[PDB]
Design a binder for this molecule. Structure first.
Ligand SMILES: C[C@@H]1O[C@H](O)[C@@H](O)[C@H](O)[C@@H]1O
Ligand SMILES: C[C@@H]1O[C@H](O)[C@@H](O)[C@H](O)[C@@H]1O
Ligand SMILES: C[C@@H]1O[C@H](O)[C@@H](O)[C@H](O)[C@@H]1O
Ligand SMILES: C[C@@H]1O[C@H](O)[C@@H](O)[C@H](O)[C@@H]1O
Ligand SMILES: C[C@@H]1O[C@H](O)[C@@H](O)[C@H](O)[C@@H]1O
Ligand SMILES: C[C@@H]1O[C@H](O)[C@@H](O)[C@H](O)[C@@H]1O
Lengths: 670, 670
């Protein structure tokens, strides 16, 4: 080691920054244009520097930046991006490249966030848009304090093929790097500070938390109108419809212009849908057809290589952004289109541009690959913010720096177990992930997928190919409908969780904690432990943290710091509520409520510990909250001496939006 | 593209060298110390430069070297190292890292040779010890002459997810690189010139082509003596025994010193074996125990990181080489030890040193990883050459630059089909590979593996764990013995093929050619097409090239430019002989013949085309051949008017070694 003396500047409470060597002029935070939530960070506890006892070794050598952070024997690690099959990361080796998930945890994935969290209550972010390699406690150094005694494999039964390693080591292919370290005291505190450095989560519109149906590629405007009428007639919720590539006059590559045959009058169509409460979310990939109206203008500002024969705009250049985003604005957003699904900004390598490609800005194709999703998210979101309108959409790649964007990750993979593991890991990765529903061999699988999906960032069927609707499997149709309605009833719960994401950096879906690895349970909001069932299973084990827990459906005591064997039936996803936990429920509305609408709330209170819930309220759709037009309404509930429920809600704040109607309290635990 | 003007110097007939940017001072040829066989290269045809019509674009940008070589529509590509599941490489993307094979063709493998060959009759070698990425015809450039017309996926059934790509693109993480281009006119001509640039193949000792048994880790000197006596008593051939880690006083990490309890008198033991015709091949990994006698001396010249708690010598430093190789020389080689099995110089990444490791020479851990196998091969081989004694051994990693080393690659993987595919690909990779035999669930599998194994560079059972011997499966014991004896009978055939490898660069095992991919047939020498059977199969298809072919066993016409369906039985591996093909057979000796021994030959002549075979002859064991003490004896055979065989052999050369005894001729095709 020739560890270079790097000064750790405490830049916010519990956030330290170090500059090793000569960092590059482009990086993840710069690509994203991520601004820290200074106010939120200033309210966090000043905590001590996590690496109090030395062991940090950062240096530049041979054109690369070498990092080493110490580990203690007790420590487990989480993060290093959107893994699908692993949650404990100590002992893993990962190569953090943006790619479509390939079926194993190599580090190559949709959001290969270079951030990790320790069970000892700290985190570390490497701010590079390069491909980086991580050895998360596999290296064993001859000069280590903790060098294990060499053993003779010939004779010693305790010989180990993976001897004890006492450090995270990272190699960055650059002449320097910025490193951020986040204090605790708890693992979740580190994640929160990381997310706040990124600007906090996006505050979604309420409509983004409703149900979305993506329809078949072939659908015309009339086909969409019919589908909407079918949802209404069947009494299923719907807030936004996803149009797939058929809305464009050409796709792969794209014109970013409405097809004249299928959408002959886009202005009328979008308005008609909006009038029925239905927003539209449009599929794009960013790859340009010679028939796009801005093709000639943008061509010089595109890369050397194409993706499905489409030009690749260099979105680091104003000269590429202006034509591209102008077309979205004038042709779609100004007609009322609510947002986008940004597809195919991930991989595979055989589709996207090679790293040997060249871009007109001079940015490496590598850094472009690592940030392309960030860039499209960034500049598309800005179009909406400029109009004082929230958006909420989908994206197939993100990275560090992307916490604040109004996009949820999805993919073309489908293993349900792994979809839940990704949901867990999204909480460690500063991104949102939806385990989307598409098809299923069976009603049972359809319902199981639907159940976990309504306990996620976005409630969605993607029927681009399958043409399925929530009711397409008659055997589970009644229960699908109940869960679709439950998603709406729970809107005030999800909205308050997302508000915590924005204001405090609290991921709304996260792993347990926050000894053994748990890859199939997650916290959803602060109060709910979700333990999905998978098709073919009649029962599962649920590991409950210490403290009492209550059945979400019945309110009955479930357990306390123990393992349950649960046989929920097909009609229930196992969900448990913390003692004193509160779930505010609005009515089973088919459409998200408007800013000028009051909604009655039933406060479902579980257990016997006095409960406290902070209900977020604002207009649900603009950026007026940035000017202070929002409120947190404190709800408190307990049972009195008689065992009867007693509840309060703090008074509405003068001058602020108030969508809270009549409030009733229900003690779920009899 | 800012293609830099690189001058292609024709450095040998059909070999051109280009220097792009500022190449690094360490590279594959330098690591290997590979000297071209100038004489052999000077005898090859002057052919035209393969890229006659332009399309080459080489440049340095952003600290990296970008290469592009054009492709034509007709072209298929082979090589890019030791692939196990793919032979056609056009359309593949590979990351060429030394690693233990991981179960799919990622580019990470035991010998990730950065050399490819085209069906148009040329080859390209990238001389870098860095990790390089290859896009072997996947990139589609907007300014390409051959840019496919964009299609609308919405409406056009002929839309392609993988549009036509017209170039091989490569990215090297360095400020320059040397590139070598090899002419044809045939694909095999390019491979030959590449191999000759590397110095040709090693000329193995005859004993290296005999049978080797590796025995269980636990075996003592007495256990080895017994095993040898068992082979003799059962009449099975044996030339060298492999000792596994138990020969060392400690292993993982190693002392490189004979265990006092199991090998109390190594001098006597090695001599005793040698006196019975038995050579010894010793297992090592290069990782140093604190009990190695040279530990203190070598310690400063070892890397920062350990492998199974052993120090990693920096073999680019004389100060590390001297102690390490001195110990091998004085403690083993000078006692009579014939060679080594150099294990665990490949991977996985979780065992070997991270790329974040630092080495005392200042060489990157990356370049060390890419060349470690080359270095151990190089310096171990030199110990033997210094003593005018050939060696032949095993190694688990190699690379470009390694053609000339006396080592055969093996691994811990075991899929039999893939073992044959690797054998095919070894011919494109400038390395030797053996599909070794270890265990098997069934007699059938054991025999099938044994059959393909005796048609490979090294006939070997590796029984380190299984304790198996050739006769361990009673149901196939008779047939195993027949194939073991056949390996010996065929020694003059294999030896002449290996002589062509050394003198002409001709790989002794190679793929077909040299439309559809053939991953399960290979040429073995010039005359034999081998088509292995796999356990569970009663029949297979065999694709015969144009020209007549004859059954190896019966001599009967098999076919001509056609597909056969063959049901060989368990007792035969399908082998076909070209028309006029000749297989010289010596007697079924149990031990390779000595330099002063004449051996009778039966010349097995197949078909009816007049045949010509060049039989190589020399002492079979020293480097005297370098001083001209060798001969090629031309054998010619045909049938006369009566259908009776007529043969000749050229006269022995005055003053040269002559091991040829009585020569008889047999026309196999009645
Ligand atoms: C040997 C190397 O020292 C450097 O300073 C560290 O940053 C690397 O991770 C590694 O431990
Ligand atoms: C599964 C893991 O993927 C990572 O990218 C690799 O670096 C490791 O060697 C391993 O193969
Ligand atoms: C842990 C593994 O054990 C196996 O037996 C060995 O063959 C590998 O090289 C590695 O050491
Ligand atoms: C656009 C780039 O131009 C460079 O000169 C080439 O070497 C790369 O492979 C790529 O085609
Ligand atoms: C199988 C292939 O392995 C290569 O190393 C990768 O670069 C490709 O993207 C692909 O996954
Ligand atoms: C060729 C593949 O087809 C699929 O339908 C798409 O979802 C992928 O992104 C890709 O375009």
């Amino acid at each position: 080691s020739h560890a270079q003396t790097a000064n750790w500047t405490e830049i916010y409470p519990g956030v330290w920054k170090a500059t090793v060597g000569k960092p590059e002029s482009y990086d993840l935070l710069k690509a994203a244009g991520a601004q820290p939530n200074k106010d939120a960070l200033s309210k966090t506890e000043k905590v001590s520097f996590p690496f109090a006892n030395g062991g940090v070794s950062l240096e530049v050598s041979g054109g690369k930046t070498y990092l080493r952070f110490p580990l203690q024997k007790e420590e487990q690690l989480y993060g290093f991006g959107l893994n699908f099959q692993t949650v404990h990361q100590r002992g893993k080796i990962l190569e953090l490249h943006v790619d479509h998930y390939g079926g194993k945890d190599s580090g190559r994935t949709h959001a290969p966030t270079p951030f990790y969290v320790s069970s000892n209550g700290y985190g570390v972010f490497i701010n590079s848009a390069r491909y980086i390699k991580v050895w998360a406690g596999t290296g064993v150094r001859k000069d280590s304090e903790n060098f294990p005694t060499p053993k003779d494999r010939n004779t010693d039964k305790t010989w180990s093929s993976r001897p004890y390693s006492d450090a995270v080591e990272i190699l960055v292919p650059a002449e320097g790097v910025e490193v951020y370290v986040f204090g605790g005291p708890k693992p979740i505190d580190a994640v929160k500070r990381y997310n706040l450095l990124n600007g906090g989560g996006y505050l979604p519109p309420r409509w983004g938390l409703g149900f979305t149906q993506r329809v078949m590629t072939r659908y015309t405007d009339k086909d969409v109108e019919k589908e909407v009428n079918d949802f209404k007639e069947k009494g299923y919720p719907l807030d936004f419809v996803g149009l797939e590539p058929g809305w464009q006059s050409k796709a792969y590559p794209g014109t970013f212009s409405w097809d004249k045959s299928r959408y002959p009058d886009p202005t009328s169509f979008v308005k008609k849908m909006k009038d029925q409460g239905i927003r539209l979310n449009l599929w794009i990939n960013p790859y340009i057809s010679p028939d796009a109206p801005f093709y000639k203008e943008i061509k010089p500002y595109t890369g050397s290589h194409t993706v499905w024969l489409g030009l690749v705009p260099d979105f680091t250049m104003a000269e590429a952004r202006k034509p591209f985003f102008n077309q979205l604005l004038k042709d779609q957003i100004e007609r009322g289109v609510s947002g986008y699904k940004i597809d195919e900004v991930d991989g595979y390598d055989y589709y996207l541009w090679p790293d040997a490609a060249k871009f007109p800005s001079g940015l490496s194709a590598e850094q472009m690959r690592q940030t392309y999703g960030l860039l499209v998210q960034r500049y598309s979101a800005e179009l909406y913010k400029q109009r004082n309108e929230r958006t909420f959409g989908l994206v197939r790649a993100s990275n560090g720096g992307g916490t604040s964007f109004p996009y949820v990750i999805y993919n073309d993979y489908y293993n349900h177990q792994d979809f839940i593991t990704a949901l867990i890991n999204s909480g460690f990765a500063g991104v949102l992930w939806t385990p989307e529903v598409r098809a299923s061999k069976s009603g049972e699988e359809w319902l199981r997928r639907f159940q976990s999906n309504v306990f996620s960032p976005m409630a969605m069927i993607n029927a681009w190919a399958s043409g399925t609707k929530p009711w397409s499997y008659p055997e589970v149709e009644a229960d699908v409908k109940k869960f679709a309605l439950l998603r709406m009833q729970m809107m005030p719960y999800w909205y308050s969780a997302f508000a915590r994401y924005h204001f405090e950096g609290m991921p709304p879906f996260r792993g347990m904690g926050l000894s053994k690895e748990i890859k199939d349970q997650y916290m959803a909001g602060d109060d709910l432990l979700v333990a999905p069932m998978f098709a073919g299973e009649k029962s599962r084990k649920v590991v409950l943290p210490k403290g009492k827990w209550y059945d979400f459906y019945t309110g009955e005591y479930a357990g306390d710091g123990e393992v349950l064997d649960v046989t929920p039936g097909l009609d229930k996803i196992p969900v448990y509520v913390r003692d004193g936990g509160i779930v505010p429920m609005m009515p089973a509305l088919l459409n998200s409520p408007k800013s000028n609408q009051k909604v009655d709330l039933e406060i479902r209170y579980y257990g016997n510990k006095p409960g406290e819930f902070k209900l977020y309220d604002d207009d649900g759709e603009t950026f007026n909250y940035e000017k202070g037009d929002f409120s947190w309404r404190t709800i408190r509930v307990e049972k009195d001496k008689s065992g009867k429920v007693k509840g309060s809600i703090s008074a509405a704040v003068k001058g602020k939006v108030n969508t809270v109607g009549k409030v009733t309290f229900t003690a779920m635990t009899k």
